Amino acid sequence: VKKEAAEKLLEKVPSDVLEMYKAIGGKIYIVDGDITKHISLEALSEDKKKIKD
């Protein structure tokens, strides 16, 4: 009789395609602190306000 030999049908593995999608990449955006300056006097005042006759 003649031997099969068996060279196989399956080629490589999914693992390369699996690794392709497995890509995670970079996520999220900068927020919160930004720059922050601010300056004006809407908080408190100062002006002569007494009483007399």
Add this chain to the structure above:
Amino acid sequence: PTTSLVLGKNQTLATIKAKENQLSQILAPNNYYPSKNLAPIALNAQDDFSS
């Protein structure tokens, strides 16, 4: 002082007015601010709040 960082022939990087970190209270004649034994001061800011 109002100073200016300049590259090259006349390529001005920036013009910076001295902030409150860079204030000198006294500059008597024939003197340095700061004194010669001490190290010179650092200017690294652009904004009035130096942020």
